[PDB]
Amino acid sequence: GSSGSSGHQQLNSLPTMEGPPTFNPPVPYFGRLQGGLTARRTIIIKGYVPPTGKSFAINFKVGSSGDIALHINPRMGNGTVVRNSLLNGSWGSEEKKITHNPFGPGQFFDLSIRCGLDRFKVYANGQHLFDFAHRLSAFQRVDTLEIQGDVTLSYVQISGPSSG
Numbered sequence: 001g002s003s004g005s006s007g008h009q010q011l012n013s014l015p016t017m018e019g020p021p022t023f024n025p026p027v028p029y030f031g032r033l034q035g036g037l038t039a040r041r042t043i044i045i046k047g048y049v050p051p052t053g054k055s056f057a058i059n060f061k062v063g064s065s066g067d068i069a070l071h072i073n074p075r076m077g078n079g080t081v082v083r084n085s086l087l088n089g090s091w092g093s094e095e096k097k098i099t100h101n102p103f104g105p106g107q108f109f110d111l112s113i114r115c116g117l118d119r120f121k122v123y124a125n126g127q128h129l130f131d132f133a134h135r136l137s138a139f140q141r142v143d144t145l146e147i148q149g150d151v152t153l154s155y156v157q158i159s160g161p162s163s164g
Contacts, residue, residue: 017032022153023155025155026153027147027148027152031145031158032143033063033158034143035160036062037060038115038161039116040115040160041159042112042114042160043115046153047109047153047154047155047156049106049107049150050150054150055076055149056148057149058071059071059145059146062138062141063143063144065088067136068087069136069139069141070085070120070132071085074103079101080098081129082094082096093135095132099130100129102127102129108154110125119133120134
């Protein structure tokens with residue numbers, strides 16, 4: 001009484017994330033950034049916090065090496081989104097600073113992170129959520145965006161230099 005099977009003749013990695021945006025992406029959702037953290041890059045995450053989900057987490061690893069430059073994790077309970085960054089065999093620190101926490105169990109939430117040169121700019125439903133100080137100088141290297149935990153992703157697309 002069991003169905004479904006991975007079946008992989010030879011372990012390999014998924015192709016590029018080109019083409020149209022993702023629809024109803026599973027979790028954890030692993031979305032590699034084509035290019036990397038570039039001043040002209042904007043990350044967008046449209047999902048919804050389930051009533052049975054404690055909280056999720058959005059970590060940004062590097063496709064090249066594999067280090068986390070930014071690790072944001074919202075907290076529906078207390079109401080504080082912690083920010084960290086795991087470095088090569090090392091770790092950064094815990095950063096908490098927000099004006100309004102929309103993330104709520106039972107209601108949708110539009111999150112959009114902006115990649116810049118001095119720092120990042122996260123927005124929530126048209127509201128400056130918080131900023132992320134450049135911890136890893138090699139931020140540009142970061143070309144991987146993964147999302148684990150308890151979150152209902154609906155639409156995910158890594159806006160790039162395309163629009164122009």
